[PDB]
């Protein structure tokens, strides 16, 4: 009932990509910042040669809502 | 004979202004009001004066403001976070100014806050009621304090003024690097939003009370008794005797010549040109050929100041 | 009566005008000069001044040594990393020849890249950038496209960023052609490689290529403030409604600096054509102390209908000689 409607943190990632089909949260070493972890699984990435690849994308809550992709592989 | 020179100019200034704003005599009417003028007109004076960022009579200036996030701008937009979007009615905009014609200089001003870092701004056009089209394009700085920036959409007024679309609007998104430009999500931090001085269109445009210089296009083909550019071609062998320039061997240069009658700052209005070209030659140092360029000396039109 | 010897009075201040603007007393010696040979590289430097016709201060005055420089071919360095494709077009530049072509940034003037346009009929939008830390790229100006149907010649102001690059010994540079981003492909044809054309031909096809044309000030030259007399300087004067016109009608302004230029511009006096960039800049038959540069005002008056006007060209800011 205590989850705030009035003014939520909107994250967007590209169109088309199915941005937010897999979501999670991310809590690394010791007591830094925190991040939203959203899946994109039909992104079209740089990978040469891979078309919609996919990827994960790290966006960082502390402000400014600006997402960051992952580099998981860049190889095509 | 100091006090001399200034006295003439005066009487020059008392004839123009008043062939500017097609008066022959100053007016005299009731009078209101008797403390400080209203400030609806002092909203627009204080704006005219504001710069930050031929037709030599005067243009009536009006402005209009825009739309509340009411009245419909709710049902379309509203949550593009890095974008900003602003709406109109033609109903008002067709009053100020009756024939698209009279229509001078229309341009958006709006109203910046934030202070910090720089970012990057791209404008666009309605079209479709769905579709943006880009317009122009303009960097900012820095600035300490709250800024005036302000976009000539002349061209886009213009057209809007001949179509019976009651209901037309602009948007401002950020860059696209192939979503910057806005950080918050209350959209009213880096401007102003549903409060007062919110963006309006400031328009300069000719009175119907009014309506109701030419170059080598009109200066060759026609034989004027005033201020044209006259026709001369210069020889570098035949007018100069220089054979120390290979290219070019002779060019049109041109001159002014003219009178100049009823208007300001120089005692006498003399024909003096009012765009010039460049000229690029070639000549040669000992053995060393230099292509170089000179500043202004092809004369293409001609004014009178 | 006037007579046609204006002409003539524009002639000899032609003559004392191109010579100060090469900063030269009499004109150099051409018999330590070929006669005969004229290479078709100074030729195409002259004919790209010419060609534009697409495309958007003490020291403007003097002239400046207009020297192009070719780009890179795809055939070393613009294959190993992208290549070309359908979302970017990549051109490259060495730098020994561009600080060869001016040695010391500072000369740098105006530095314009120039392309070729093919044949593109509706509609399409380019978006220009820079190459940062050899990897980002940062984005310069942008601009719409007309249907020409010929072959057309570009050109772009990036005078910025070869000055930053002159002042790096960066050893490679080069540019990047993007088009428009609709956010919420590239259509351009521009005078390519095309990868494929062999032959004799073949080695012709480099030519037209996409050049830097850099307009900057030899080394040679190099080196009311500049008289002691009144010269033709903007003079102050305050002009008031109430005092110096006696107009009660005008609510708003209450008074402006409306100033005036005063003093002579004469030409070919006795005694060593030095003084050309403040007496006769224009080389006209007769030089007058007119405003170059003037501001709108906007006024309040009334009629029961208040109107705010503005009127166009009324304060003098500075005066010149033309
Ligand atoms: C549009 O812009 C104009 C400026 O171009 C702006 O005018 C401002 O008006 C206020 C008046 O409300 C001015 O404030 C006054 O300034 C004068 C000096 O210029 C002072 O003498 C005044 O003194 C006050 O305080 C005294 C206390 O002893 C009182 O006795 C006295 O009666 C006065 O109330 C007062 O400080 C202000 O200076 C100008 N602005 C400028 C730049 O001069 C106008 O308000 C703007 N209008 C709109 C609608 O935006
Ligand atoms: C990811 O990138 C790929 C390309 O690498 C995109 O696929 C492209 O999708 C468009 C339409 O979505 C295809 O264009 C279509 O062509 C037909 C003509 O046959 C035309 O009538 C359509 O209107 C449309 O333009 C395009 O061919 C296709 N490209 C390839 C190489 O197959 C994909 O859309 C991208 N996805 C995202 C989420 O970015």
Redesign the interface.
């Known amino acids: 009932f205590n989850l705030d409607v009035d003014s939520p943190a909107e994250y967007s990632g590209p169109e088309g990509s199915y941005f937010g089909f897999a979501v999670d949260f991310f809590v690394p070493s010791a007591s830094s910042r925190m991040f939203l972890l959203v899946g994109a699984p039909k992104a079209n990435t740089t990978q040469p040669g891979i078309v919609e690849g996919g990827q994960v994308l790290k966006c960082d809550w502390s402000s400014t809502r600006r997402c960051q992709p992952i580099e998981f592989d860049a190889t095509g | 004979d100091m006090e001399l020179?200034?006295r003439k100019?005066?009487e020059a200034?008392?004839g123009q202004?008043l062939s500017?704003?097609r008066l022959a005599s100053?007016?005299?009417?009731?009078?209101?009001p008797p403390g400080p003028?209203?400030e609806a007109?002092?909203a627009?004076?204080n704006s005219?004066?504001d710069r930050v960022a031929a037709?030599?009579?005067?243009?009536?200036?009006?402005r209009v403001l825009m739309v509340e996030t009411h009245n419909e701008i709710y049902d379309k937009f509203k949550?593009?976070?890095?974008?900003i979007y602003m709406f109109f009615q033609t109903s008002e905009l067709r009053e100020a100014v009756p024939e698209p014609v009279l229509l001078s200089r229309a341009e958006l001003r709006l109203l910046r806050l934030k202070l910090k870092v720089e970012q990057?701004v791209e404008l666009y056009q309605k079209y479709s009621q769905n579709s943006?089209r880009?317009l122009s394009?303009r960097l900012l700085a820095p600035s300490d304090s709250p800024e005036w920036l302000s976009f000539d959409v002349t061209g886009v007024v213009r057209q809007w003024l001949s179509r019976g679309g009651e209901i037309e609007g602009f948007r401002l998104?950020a860059?696209?690097?192939?979503?910057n430009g806005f950080?918050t999500?209350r959209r009213g931090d880096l401007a102003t939003i549903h409060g007062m001085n919110r963006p309006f269109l400031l328009l300069?445009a000719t009175?119907l009370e009014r309506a109701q210089a030419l170059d080598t296009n009109y200066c060759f083909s026609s034989t004027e008794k005033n201020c044209c550019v006259?026709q001369?071609y210069?020889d570098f062998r035949k007018?100069?005797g220089?054979?120390?320039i290979?290219?070019p061997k002779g060019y049109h240069?041109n001159?002014?010549?003219g009178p100049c009658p009823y208007p300001?700052?120089?005692?006498?209005?003399?024909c003096?040109?009012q765009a010039?070209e460049p000229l690029?030659?070639?000549?040669?140092?000992?053995?060393k050929?230099?292509?170089?360029?000179?500043?202004?000396?092809i004369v293409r039109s001609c004014k009178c100041?």
């Open positions: 020179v200034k100019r005066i200034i008392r202004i500017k704003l100053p007016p005299s009417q009731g009078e209101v003028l209203p007109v002092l627009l004076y005219t004066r037709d030599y009579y005067a243009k009536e200036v009006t949550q593009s976070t890095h974008s990057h943006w880009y394009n998104s860059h696209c690097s192939c979503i950080t999500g300069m009175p006259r001369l210069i007018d100069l220089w054979k120390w290979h290219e240069a001159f002014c010549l300001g700052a120089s005692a006498a209005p003399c003096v040109p010039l690029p030659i070639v000549y040669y140092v000992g053995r050929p230099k292509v170089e360029q000179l500043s202004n000396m100041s």
